[PDB]
């Protein structure tokens, strides 16, 4: 087990080459935000953009496009009803995040089915929140599981793995990871990442981050990191570590840590660690 520290950040966050263009920094499609939870996908989008993703496209209810553009004009917006366009943006994506604010309805199930069906070996797929629940209910078989990332909290991991909370032990968690062949970012008070290699144990987090939207922000950072950096699980560990490092720093002054504040801090923190 590797216990995370700033060295993960110096490892993962590379200085950009002088002659770089947007697409070098990845195309991300974020999918979520039903009519009640549009804010969730807006928080993931803000995190993704602030993290350095080259191009961010958001598939979300058209209700949410207006407030999303008020806060995140850098994002392209596609509604759930724009079937041809949404299919196209997903095909062209380097990274797909599905789940923030997604909910559990039929359109949600169809989009997940479509994403999974088309998933290609070169694409990262992050399945978060209610998308983990849908995936668990639908008996899918992943074509390229090594490129799928699940970000469950402990209750979603019970749904996915059948491990009850008390049995969510290092060895049992690893065995269920192995069964899937995917990366499991098991979110908790101290988040642990299970994969083909040596698990990563996060060392930060505070209860001031126990507020709505914190996981949406993390998912957006993970997507942005996978858009830009080496396609190894260390990159995901870097995202996880940075999310809580900024949170822990904010918590020194702020009783609750608003997720937008974590996103807004990303450019200055990343510059600090970018490998010289």
Burial class of residue 4 in the structure, from the number of CB atoms within 10 Å of its CB (0-12 exposed, 13-18 middle, 19+ buried): buried
Please give the backbone phi and psi of residue 53, each rounded to the nearest 5 degrees, phi first: -55, 140
26, 32, 39, 199: which one contacts a copy of itself (CB under 8 A)? 39
Q: Measured from the CB atom, is 27 or 147 closer to a copy of itself?
A: 27
Return the residue of 1, 18, 121, 139 that touches a copy of itself, per CB under 8 A. 18
Q: d(Cα 33, Cα 107) in Å, to the nearest integer?
A: 12
Is 19 near a copy of itself (CB under 8 A)? yes
Confirm or reject binding of residue 83 to a copy of itself (CB under 8 A): no
Q: Does 276 bind a copy of itself (CB under 8 A)?
A: no
Q: What is the CA radius of gyration of the chain?
A: 17
User: Per rule CB under 8 A, is residue 211 in the interface with a copy of itself?
Assistant: yes
Q: Which is nearer to a copy of itself, 139 or 255 (CB)?
A: 255
Residue numbers 172-201 binding a copy of itself by CB under 8 A: 189
Breaks (C-N over 2.5 A) in the chain follow: none
Q: Which stretch binds a copy of itself (CB under 8 A): 18-26, 115-123, 140-148, 163-171?
A: 18-26
- Give binding residues for AMP as ranges: 215
- Answer for which of 32, 152, 199, 213 binds a copy of itself (CB under 8 A) is 213
The smaller minimum CB distance to a copy of itself, of residues 35 and 113, is found at: 35
Stretch that binds a copy of itself, among 1-9, 127-135, 163-171, 205-213 (CB under 8 A): 205-213
Work out whether 106 is an interface residue with a copy of itself (CB under 8 A): no
Q: Where along the sequence are the contacts to a copy of itself (CB under 8 A)?
A: 13, 16-22, 24-25, 35-40, 42-43, 49-52, 54-56, 63-78, 85, 189, 206-208, 210-213, 253-260, 266-268, 270-271, 274
């Amino acid at each position: 087990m590797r216990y995370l520290s700033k060295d993960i950040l110096e490892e993962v966050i590379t200085q950009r080459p002088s002659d770089s263009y947007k697409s070098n920094f990845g195309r991300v499609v974020l999918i979520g935000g039903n009519r009640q939870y549009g804010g969730a996908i807006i928080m993931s989008t803000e995190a993704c953009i602030n993290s350095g993703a080259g191009l961010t496209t958001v598939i979300t209810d058209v209700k949410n496009h207006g407030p999303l553009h008020a806060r995140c004009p850098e994002a392209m917006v596609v509604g759930f009803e724009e079937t041809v366009l949404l299919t196209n943006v997903v095909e062209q994506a380097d990274v797909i995040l599905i789940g923030p604010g997604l909910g559990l309805d039929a359109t949600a199930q169809q989009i997940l089915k479509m994403v999974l069906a088309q998933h290609q070996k070169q694409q990262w797929l992050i399945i978060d929140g209610s998308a983990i629940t849908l995936f668990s209910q639908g008996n899918f078989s992943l074509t390229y599981p090594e490129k799928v990332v699940f970000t469950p909290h402990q209750m979603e991991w019970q749904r996915l793995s059948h491990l009850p909370i008390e049995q969510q032990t290092l060895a049992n968690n690893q065995r269920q990871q192995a069964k899937l062949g995917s990366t499991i970012v098991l979110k908790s008070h101290r988040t642990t990442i299970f994969h083909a290699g040596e698990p990563f144990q996060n060392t930060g987090g505070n209860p001031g981050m126990a507020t709505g939207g914190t996981g949406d922000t993390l998912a957006g950072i993970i997507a942005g990191f996978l858009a830009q950096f080496k396609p190894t699980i260390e990159t995901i560990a870097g995202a996880v570590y940075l999310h809580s490092l900024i949170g822990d720093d904010l918590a020194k002054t702020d009783y609750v840590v608003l997720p937008t504040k974590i996103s807004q801090a990303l450019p200055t923190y990343m510059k600090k660690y970018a490998q010289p």
